[PDB]
Swiss-Prot record:
This is High molecular weight rhoptry protein 2. The chain holds residues 38 to 173 of 1378 of the full protein. It comes from Plasmodium falciparum (isolate NF54). Participates in the formation of new permeability pathways in Plasmodium-infected erythrocytes enabling the uptake of nutrients from the blood plasma. Required for maintaining invasion capacity of merozoites. Required for parasite growth and proliferation. The lineage of its organism: Eukaryota, Sar, Alveolata, Apicomplexa, Aconoidasida. Disulfide bonds join 9-34. It is found in: Host cell membrane; Parasitophorous vacuole membrane; Host cytoplasm; Cytoplasm.
Length: 123
């Protein structure tokens, strides 16, 4: 598990792609702390009542990619579905596909300063 703990913290930073924004010491402060957290998060993400903790954390990985991560494209074999199935390893493919599409539309929902102002609601 601790080996898999070292897998994810590399896999998260490979997904974040924040390489110009973090320091070399920041990655050192990163790998120590996410080694502590994820071992708890894998426990809570299993019991399906307590899934809101992992639902925010997997959202928080995606949201840091949009703001600080370089969205210049650079396949790379690491997506949300790499990260989600690693935690969910601790459902059919469609439901996994839907929850990530739920996560993608929520990140677009958070960044609608230009969108929502021009929008006029007429349902």
């Amino acid at each position: 598990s601790a080996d898999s703990n070292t897998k994810l913290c590399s896999d998260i930073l490979k997904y974040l792609y924040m390489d110009e924004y973090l320091s070399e010491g920041d990655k050192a402060t990163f790998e120590k702390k996410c080694h502590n957290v994820i071992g708890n998060i894998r426990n809570t993400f299993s019991n399906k009542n307590t899934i809101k903790e992992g639902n925010e954390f997997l959202m928080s990985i995606l949201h840091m990619k949009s703001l600080y991560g370089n969205n210049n494209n650079n396949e790379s074999d690491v997506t949300l579905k790499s990260l989600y199935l690693s935690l969910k390893g601790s459902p059919s493919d469609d439901e996994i596909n839907k929850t990530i599409m739920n996560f993608v539309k929520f990140n677009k929902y958070l960044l609608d300063n230009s969108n929502d102002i021009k929008k006029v609601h007429d349902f």
